[PDB]
A paper describes a structure:
Glycyl tRNA synthetases (GlyRSs) are prospective drug targets for combating Mycobacterium tuberculosis (Mtb) and cancer in humans. Structures of all three forms – complete, or in some cases partial – have now been determined using X-ray diffraction or cryo-EM. Both Mycobacterial and human cells express the α2 subtype, and notably, the GlyRS gene in humans encodes one product that serves both the cytosol and mitochondria, which has obvious advantages for the design of selective inhibitors. Similar to the TtGlyRS, the two Mycobacterial GlyRS subunits adopt the canonical architecture consisting of an N-terminal catalytic domain and a C-terminal anticodon binding domain connected by a β-hairpin insertion. The catalytic core contains the class-II specific antiparallel β-sheet having the characteristic insertion domain after the first strand of the core β-sheet, and the anticodon recognition domain adopts the HGPT fold also found in HisRS, ProRS, and ThrRS.
In the present study, high-resolution crystal structures of MtbGlyRS and MtrGlyRS bound to glycyl-AMS were determined by X-ray diffraction to resolutions of 2.25 and 1.95 Å, respectively. To produce MtbGlyRS, the glyQS gene (with an N-terminal purification tag) was cloned into an M. smegmatis expression vector pDTCF and transformed into M. smegmatis, and expression of MtbGlyRS was induced by anhydrotetracycline. The present study describes the first crystal structures of bacterial class IIa GlyRSs bound to glycyl-AMS and magnesium, which closely recapitulate the binding site architecture of the glycyl-adenylate-bound TtGlyRS. In the glycyl group binding site, the carbonyl oxygen forms hydrogen bonds with both the Arg197 and Gln214 side chains. The amino group is held by the carboxylates of Glu216, Glu165, and Glu324. The configuration of the carboxylates, especially that of Glu324, together with the presence of the side chain of Ala326, impede the binding of pro S substituents, thus providing the molecular basis for the substrate specificity. In transitioning from the AMP to glycyl-AMS bound states, the largest conformational change involves closure of the lid motif, with displacements having magnitudes as great as 5.6 Å that accompany a twist in the central sheet. While the lid and glycyl-AMS lack close contacts, the hydroxyl group of Tyr264 is placed 3.6 Å from the electrophilic glycyl carbonyl carbon. In contrast to previously solved structures containing related ligands, the structures presented here also detail the magnesium coordination sphere.
Residue numbers in the entry:
A (entry chain A), B (entry chain A): 3 to 88, 138 to 342, 352 to 461
């Protein structure tokens, strides 16, 4: 099973560790190791660039994990965010702030990042001077008391989301819903996930969250036992539910004033809400490849956690100086690895297994011509390149990182 | 008072908003607005590059906010992480995982990120193949039930830290403590904080945390009422306290085996632990400048949240096309702003107030020569540059972003 093989790879090479492994570990709680944090950050950079900073109609925020409790009463989560089990059980995590543990310092950890955006809608309109159609994007931790946490990092109690609320004139919501479904689906494909392992699934009206009139899920073919498909991201039409309920509960006008047409209306909201940690899982699974056999993690070079590995042909004291000066130069621009242990052939394979797009070998000939050998991960091609031109050579091939 | 003037600027321009402002707001809980999230991320990038990816002896991780409870018993936080008030009160925030609220699903939100590093020490040594002296760095949220939260974002219950644990041979700890004090102090100065507004303060032995044998604080002259200095970052020698106590409580050997010299020892730990949100506060305060008067936020261009502003001389329908094509081009590489509202003079000043290093004006002459005017924030100089060479012109001046 590819999924089991990929999970074991992730653990073995330090993409992830079980949180508190030495004490047993919380239920499917996971830490991200050296390779994992870089891959996770690279995914965040690509989402932020595509959804926020690369666009002229979206701005970002970073709201607090712990908001005033009334936020989650007004949003309705207090009332309906529960599941029956064996009695109804609310899935929000609780904490108590301040010196007294009275039900007065009670707060909820956010189960979604969306509400921190909604309650700031008027703030952002004011300081960013935005007019619908425009969006507010955010990446951060959310918390849910999942009853059956598992499937690796697919379903955890602590996870990270990448959510954007796109505020539009109500009569335009349907075409903007289609736009963002297509835009988000294509984001995964642009970053290397095979089109055939993705699909769209529309929620039946009885499977809609309390805030949505229509949700379309982007699903990935993870390879689970039974049904191998799993929700990767939800794109929902939340209409004016969220701004209306916070205006009603807070007493603050959250409508938008269209100065041009002197009209006041509450925008509708289209919301792409992706799972950072689930996308992490999907990119690894889809990249995994068993090509005289070879294991290759064929990650988009923009996502690969290590962009290049400097590998001296041997531990020889004459190779180290030139190789270490090169690594120091490349580290100014990218995350790179240095490895002189063992047969160079096994070191190539070690890098291929974690998706490193390029290996740079400093051999004995490098001391007479001042050039090195660059190996491409997928094709295993081999080009000889001037030491002073290696950074340029890699920059052209890592553009967008 | 500069500090009050800077706080009000931050709120007014959307560097920060009070969390849940429309409902009153948690005690000194703050959201980061469009400008703030970019500045915060830019600070994180500079720390990660300087402490982690730019070095050959440090790797990163991202451990969970919520670890197994036994982590915080073993660390001693359960026993001693309390302050007397009016009775001793533990300052860790609590939550309950799982369906039962018995004192069995009880967990603590981490009051520091360090413990997630320590319990993974053997994991990281294994998968990253590191040998002391080496470090493990991390950025993430921490939580403390501060009794008197205030001073803006200086002391909050939810905040972000940038911590690195540098594991060394015990006999080398003192010189590595000096190294990291100097390295961290200089990081702030390299990013533009005036040397005279920083100082070092050594904790008296009676003011040492339970895990440290010696702590030196980097303090910044925030301008508080009374004593204007405040802790910006702590660099502590935690000796072998943390690895020893987790080995003792978990039963897992967390020593390091030096294969070369066949010696087994528990490394000492030097720990730079910075406050992301406090550094955010310090960079704003120190950049604030009142130079015919002008208000300028003189942020290092690597930190500035908006790298360039595209400003058509007017709303004229002939300027928009060329200006919008330029903004679209620059957004491929940087966060940029577009503003055609009001007198160009006031738009320059609007950008200066938030530290934008460059304004790019598309005037009527631009349509006959296909060049634009670039204005430098600090000097207000003005250079005429070919449309097709603007990205190169800015890239050279934003290197390191
Ligand atoms: N704001 C709208 C919304 O929240 N919508 S959604 O509730 O559908 O979660 C949005 C995304 O968060 C991810 N996600 C959700 N729950 C979990 C979990 N327990 N573990 C990991 N990832 C998860 C998943 O990728 C899902 O598509
Ligand atoms: N691991 C070692 C350590 O934790 N050490 S330290 O406890 O000293 O916190 C480290 C840093 O976190 C920041 N910091 C601490 N508490 C707060 C707070 N309540 N609000 C904002 N920033 C804070 C501050 O910048 C401080 O220097
Ligand atoms: Cl756009
Ligand atoms: Cl404003
Ligand atoms: Cl180094
Ligand atoms: Cl390994
Ligand atoms: Mg869903
Ligand atoms: Mg301190």
């Amino acid at each position: 099973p590819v999924i089991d093989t990929v999970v074991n790879l992730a653990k073995r090479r330090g993409f992830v560790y079980p949180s508190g492994e030495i004490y047993g570990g919380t239920k499917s709680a996971w830490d991200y190791g050296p390779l994992g944090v870089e891959l996770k950050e690279n995914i965040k950079r690509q989402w932020w660039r595509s959804v926020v900073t690369g666009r002229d109609d979206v701005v970002g925020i970073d709201s607090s994990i712990i908001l005033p409790r009334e936020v989650w009463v007004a949003s309705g989560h207090v009332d309906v965010f529960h599941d029956p089990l064996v009695r109804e059980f609310n899935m929000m995590l609780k904490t108590y702030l301040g010196p007294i543990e009275t039900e007065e310092g009670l707060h909820y950890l956010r189960p979604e990042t969306a509400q921190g955006i909604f309650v700031n809608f008027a703030n952002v309109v004011t300081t960013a001077r935005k007019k619908p159609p425009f969006g507010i994007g955010q990446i951060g931790k959310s918390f849910r008391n999942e009853i059956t946490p598992g499937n690796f990092i697919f379903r955890t109690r602590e996870f990270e989301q990448m959510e954007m609320e796109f505020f539009v004139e109500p009569a335009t919501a349907k075409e903007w819903h289609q736009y963002w479904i297509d835009n988000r689906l294509q984001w995964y494909i642009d970053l290397g996930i095979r089109r055939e392992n993705l699909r769209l699934w529309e929620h039946p009206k009885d499977k809609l969250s309390h805030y949505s009139d229509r949700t379309v899920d982007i699903e990935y073919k993870f390879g689970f036992m039974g049904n191998p498909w799993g929700e990767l991201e939800g794109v929902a039409n939340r209409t004016d539910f969220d701004l209306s309920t916070h205006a009603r509960h807070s007493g603050v006008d959250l409508s938008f004033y269209d100065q041009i047409n002197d009209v006041r209306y509450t925008p509708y909201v289209i919301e792409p809400a992706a799972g950072l940690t689930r996308s992490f899982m999907a990119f690894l699974i889809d990249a995994y490849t068993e090509d005289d056999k070879r294991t290759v993690l064929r990650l988009d070079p923009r996502l690969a956690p290590v962009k290049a590995a400097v590998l001296p042909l041997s531990r020889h004291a004459d190779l180290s100086p030139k190789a270490r000066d090169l690594g120091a130069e490349l580290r100014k621009c990218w995350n790179i690895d240095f490895d002189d242990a063992g047969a160079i052939g096994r070191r190539y394979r070690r890098q291929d297994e974690v998706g490193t797009p390029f290996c740079v070998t400093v051999d004995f000939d490098s001391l007479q011509d001042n050039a090195v050998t660059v190996r491409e991960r997928d094709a295993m091609t081999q080009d000889r390149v001037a030491m002073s031109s290696v950074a340029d050579y890699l920059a052209v091939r890592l553009k967008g990182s």
